[PDB]
Amino acid sequence: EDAELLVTVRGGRLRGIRLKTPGGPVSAFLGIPFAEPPMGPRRFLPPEPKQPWSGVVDATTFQSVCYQYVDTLYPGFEGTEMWNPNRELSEDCLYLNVWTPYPRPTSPTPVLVWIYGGGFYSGASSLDVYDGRFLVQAERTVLVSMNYRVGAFGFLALPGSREAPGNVGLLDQRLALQWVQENVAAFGGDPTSVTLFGESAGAASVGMHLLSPPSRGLFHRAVLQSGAPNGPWATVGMGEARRRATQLAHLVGCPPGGTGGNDTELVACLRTRPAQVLVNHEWHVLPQESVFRFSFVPVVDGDFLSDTPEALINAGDFHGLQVLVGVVKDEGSYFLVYGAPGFSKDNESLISRAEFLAGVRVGVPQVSDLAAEAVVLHYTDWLHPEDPARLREALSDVVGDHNVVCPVAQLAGRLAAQGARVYAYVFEHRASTLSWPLWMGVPHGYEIEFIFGIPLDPSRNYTAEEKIFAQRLMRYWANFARTGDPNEPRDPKAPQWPPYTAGAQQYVSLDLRPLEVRRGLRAQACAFWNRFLPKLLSAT
Amino acid sequence: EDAELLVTVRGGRLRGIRLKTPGGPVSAFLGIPFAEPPMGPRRFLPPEPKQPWSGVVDATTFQSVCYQYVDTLYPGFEGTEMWNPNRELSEDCLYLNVWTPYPRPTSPTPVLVWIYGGGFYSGASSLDVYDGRFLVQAERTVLVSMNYRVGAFGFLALPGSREAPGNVGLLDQRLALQWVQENVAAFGGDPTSVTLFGESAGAASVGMHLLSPPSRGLFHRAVLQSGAPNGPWATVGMGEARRRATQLAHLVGCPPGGTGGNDTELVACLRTRPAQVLVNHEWHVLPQESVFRFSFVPVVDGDFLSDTPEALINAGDFHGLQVLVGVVKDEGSYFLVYGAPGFSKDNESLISRAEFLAGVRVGVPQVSDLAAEAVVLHYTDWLHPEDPARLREALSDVVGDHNVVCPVAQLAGRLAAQGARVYAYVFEHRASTLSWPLWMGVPHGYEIEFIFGIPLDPSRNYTAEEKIFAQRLMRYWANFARTGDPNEPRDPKAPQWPPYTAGAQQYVSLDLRPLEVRRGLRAQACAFWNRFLPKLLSAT
């Protein structure tokens, strides 16, 4: 009972809180510090482990959200504000959360570790859609989720220097993984059965941990939902990361007018600026340059990532690894309202031929004019080259394929053909409570609410079929966490989920209907991006 | 005592509140309804007078702010969030506020009526900087301020139609003036000594009431601070107002796909949309245009304004009218951070030669390429054509002169030369508590806190010199409200404020020093805008 809400870890004692679900209680420990607050001189530096504390740290509520830009595209809209910070902003944000079933597991139980997304510039583990009380109750697994520094505070990089080495937001996640190895046993979790699962930039983070040797030894399985480290938005070069960091310093008045600016004086000037000042000038470091162009992302410096994610994926052995990858049916429609001309969530977004030609330049940035043409000519239905509805879905595919679906399919094929066991899915169910317009279909990020069993919340107006569908998805994710195989270990009644291989390229469709096997994660489209486009950009 | 907080008006009974000032108490009646809520079918329609109510309406706190865009340029910044709504948003917002001294004046007292600014798209009478408890206590005058519908709700116009006639936000102000005529006597105010004073779009509104016959009979004096009706941003043509209104309907999905769109079906579709939806698509009715191009402003339709404000000013008799006009020393610096390249409040904004050439295109929109050079060549110091600091102040002057200073000087000259007695000022004091950068000097809108005696608030950190300076400014404004002359009626010790004439063009400087008379409201610069530029734009 109340005795199970008291747990001692290597740093001290914690008091948790009991959460209610329609099927039983759950023990939650929200707000566990895993690192010293990275404030003052510790800004832009790798995280230091949290030193032990005296007394009982309160762990009954979520801690602060790391400083980040707040989306203001559609004020008062549920579809956008559900991803905005729901706690106060602070640099003191390195805290994690642990859910565990009641009664506490007596046997070592597999552990799921969630890494939120948000383009490496936003996100928090405290969002209502990441609530782990339903997944833990229904599947008796241990769920962990951490906060990591986003934006400039987590990924501003002056490569080579020691004051701003970059990738410190990735090190925050790694330190939280080392914390799980040393302390998850106190909650009834098996530190030898850890399964990372993330989404969007979280999925890219999960992939970058697979390609980093020090992080590979901290988990055993991986799940990448609608994201991958080899995406065109997920990394940046050393020279470009230096230009963006220097530009931000200029925007906030660094260095002072009559002064030199080596890497030491520049970061010293940045550390004196308030956090909100750095955030207010993040987006027009790249002006403008908003859609799929984030200013501060993981840098390829040679430390955390010894080479580019594409090179490490190709020249990598993945034997003894189980991966679960997947995307949603309409990956790009959510991002079109962020800068594509003629698009608006409040009308039908029936774009013209000229607006489609311009939209490709925003969804596929930094491409030659010849390469942009080849994209238009590949995605045009030449029997209906002027139909606005078809042009709308075409640009949605252009943006979804270039940024999400094809980097994932490229990764899933190389893993399965180099030792890894890979399962693939495509989420094709649109929630009955979805606030986005109908023409967006199944937007990016709207499978998370079903993985976490949010439809089981009695205060929400989901259908009965969606509740059963959410329970079936949670069993898929839990089975993969336990046995490395999403199929039920003994049930032959339900249709089977065949592994994804580089040849058959099999995946399943996740919706209210039973499982259906299909072949090809946009095989024809992704051949244009993964095979032809690097060839057209080679000979400029 | 508490008996003076009870007042009966022609509509019913009201209970006010006693406000504290360091020099004595003041009676305030905040939240008096002067019109029926313009919701449902009454959206976009002229206001109907508030029907009488039973009981005692509570008038102890400010009512709701009209639906409006919220500034998000610098989140958490005092300089911008002091103009954001400080109450909840609602279409039920047609309320006014009355301050009156304690004890209530027994004799008829002159009345000051405040009209807030905000580019006709924002603003509220509830902002802390518009608090009238200090002006009323120190000068024993009656202060009134109303809310009027801004944005599309106050100025969406389908000219000719009866469902969206336009200028209804100006009619809200007029109805509040009719209310003052019928009810200000109940508060101790003289309905025959009413002085309108506004700022920015408020000053433009005050000027448009001078040029509208039905509104001219509701006040006797006028004060225009940093704004004028003849400004390039303050009005719009009938055809352009129809294009902007139709574009907004398209952005919110009006009319539905298979449907025609005459002026009746279009506005009916608009009235079914939530208020926040119309606000979320207000700014990109004009795509990629923000600085001094507001989507919904007063329309020149022939009703409220029988002709353009420029035509009405030239062919108008102003005998028996006293006007007080003025600007701040740096009118344009505030607007540069809103879109001019190279500008940022957090650095020195030392722009290059190319950025100055591009900034003129944003500060002076919709002008020929030949006209843009004449602006550059007139504002370039050809001994230092590359000095960033001089180019910064140059673009600040370009924007300040074109939009504020010269439309005001054009108006002040025509008024003084056609019967009106005009006094002019230039506010040249930068507040010691100003949060904007130093290079902005005295930005637009930062004389309001001294007119309203805000430095007298003991919870604020103004200097002793600024407190005496605020009391001197309040006497200037109060004397003009009483006698139509800012000078003290019997004190010869302080320097005199000579009237502004079309020939001598005399004005005074308002700062910590005593009054100093000067000549010319940017006489050389405003000759370029008011005399030469129309000559270059005629012959394309």
Domain ranges within chain A, ordered by starting residue: 2-334+401-524
Identify the burial level of B287 via C-beta atoms within 10 angstroms of its C-beta, where 0-12 means exposed, 13-18 middle and 19 or more buried: exposed
Whether A444 is catalytic is yes
Can you tell me the distance from the alpha carbon of A508 to that of A423, in angstroms, rounded to the nearest whole number? 9
| Residue in B253, B346, B348 nearest the CB of A347 | B253
Q: For residue A83, report the phi and psi dihedrals to the nearest 5 degrees.
A: -105, -5
> What was the resolution (in A) of this experimentally determined structure?
2.8
Can you tell me the distance from the alpha carbon of B492 to that of B484, in angstroms, rounded to the nearest whole number? 17
User: How crowded is the C-beta side of A263, counted as CA atoms within 13 Å?
Assistant: 15
Cβ atoms of residues A525 and A401 within 8 Å: yes
Interface contact flag, B252 A346, Cβ < 8 Å? yes
User: How crowded is the C-beta side of A92, counted as CA atoms within 13 Å?
Assistant: 10
To the question of whether residue B102 is assigned a binding role by annotation, the answer is: no
Give per-residue burial for A9-44: e unless 16+ CB within 10 Å, then b.
bebbebebeebebeeebbbbbbbbbbbebbeeebbb
Contacts of B533 (CB under 8 A, 6+ apart): B371, B374
Query: What 3-state DSSP class applies to A501?
Result: coil
Task: Show the CA angle centred on residue A100, arms to residues A98 and A106, nearest 5°.
Answer: 130
Q: Identify residues of A whose CB sits under 8 angstroms from chain B CBs.
A: 70, 72-77, 250-253, 257, 273, 276-277, 279-281, 341, 344, 346-348, 350
Interface mutation vs chain A, best among B252, B280, B348, most A CBs within 10 Å: B280
Catalytic residue among A209, A220, A402, A444: A444
Whether A331 is catalytic is yes
Query: What 3-state DSSP class applies to A203?
Result: helix
Take residue B13 and report the two structure tokens written for it: 């009974």
Can you tell me the distance from the alpha carbon of A33 to that of A49, in angstroms, rounded to the nearest whole number? 9
Give the closest residue to B176 by CA, choosing from B49, B54, B65. B49
Take residue B347 and report the two structure tokens written for it: 């650095």
Can you tell me the distance from the alpha carbon of A19 to that of A133, in angstroms, rounded to the nearest whole number? 7
Paired sense of beta strands A109-115 and A142-146, if any: parallel
To the question of whether residue B78 is assigned a binding role by annotation, the answer is: no
Name every chain B residue with its beta carbon within 8 A of the beta carbon of A248.
Answer: none
Cβ atoms of residues B471 and B138 within 8 Å: yes
Interface contact flag, A75 B77, Cβ < 8 Å? no
Cβ atoms of residues A421 and A499 within 8 Å: yes
Cβ atoms of residues A461 and A455 within 8 Å: no
Take residue A120 and report the two structure tokens written for it: 């490496």
Q: What distance in Å separates residue A450's CA from the closest CA in chain B?
A: 28
Q: What is the C-alpha R_g of chain A?
A: 23
State which H helix or E strand residue B393 sits in: helix B388-400
Helices (H), A254-305: 263-271, 275-280
Sign of the CA dihedral running A284, A288, A291, A293: negative
Sign of the CA dihedral running A232, A235, A237, A243: positive
Name every chain B residue with its beta carbon within 8 A of the beta carbon of A251.
Answer: 344, 346-347
Interface contact flag, A346 B280, Cβ < 8 Å? yes
Name every chain B residue with its beta carbon within 8 A of the beta carbon of A279.
Answer: 75
Can you tell me the distance from the alpha carbon of B24 to that of B134, in angstroms, rounded to the nearest whole number? 10
Can you tell me the distance from the alpha carbon of B234 to that of B204, in angstroms, rounded to the nearest whole number? 7
Contacts of A79 (CB under 8 A, 6+ apart): A345, A434, A435, A436
Take residue A456 and report the two structure tokens written for it: 């089981």
Name every chain A residue with its beta carbon within 8 A of the beta carbon of B279.
Answer: 75
Give the closest residue to A349 by CA, choosing from A327, A369, A367, A334. A334
Can you tell me the distance from the alpha carbon of A409 to that of A331, in angstroms, rounded to the nearest whole number? 13
User: How crowded is the C-beta side of B336, counted as CA atoms within 13 Å?
Assistant: 36
For A2-334+401-524, CATH gives 3.40.50.1820
Q: Where are the beta strands (DSSP E) in B381-513?
A: 421-427, 506-510
Query: What 3-state DSSP class applies to A518?
Result: strand
Interface contact flag, B76 A276, Cβ < 8 Å? yes
- Angle of helix B388-400 versus helix B369-379 axis, rounded to 10: 120
Identify the burial level of A403 via C-beta atoms within 10 angstroms of its C-beta, where 0-12 means exposed, 13-18 middle and 19 or more buried: buried
State which H helix or E strand residue A134 sits in: helix A133-139
Whether B396 is catalytic is no
Q: For residue B72, report the phi and psi dihedrals to the nearest 5 degrees.
A: -125, 20
Closest residue in A to B277 (Cα–Cα): A346
Catalytic residue among B209, B402, B429, B444: B444
Q: Where are the beta strands (DSSP E) in A23-78?
A: 24-33, 56-58
Cβ atoms of residues B291 and B365 within 8 Å: yes
Q: What distance in Å separates residue B286's CA from the closest CA in chain A?
A: 12
Interface contact flag, B276 A75, Cβ < 8 Å? yes
Name every chain A residue with its beta carbon within 8 A of the beta carbon of B277.
Answer: 346
Name every chain B residue with its beta carbon within 8 A of the beta carbon of A346.
Answer: 251-253, 273, 277, 280-281
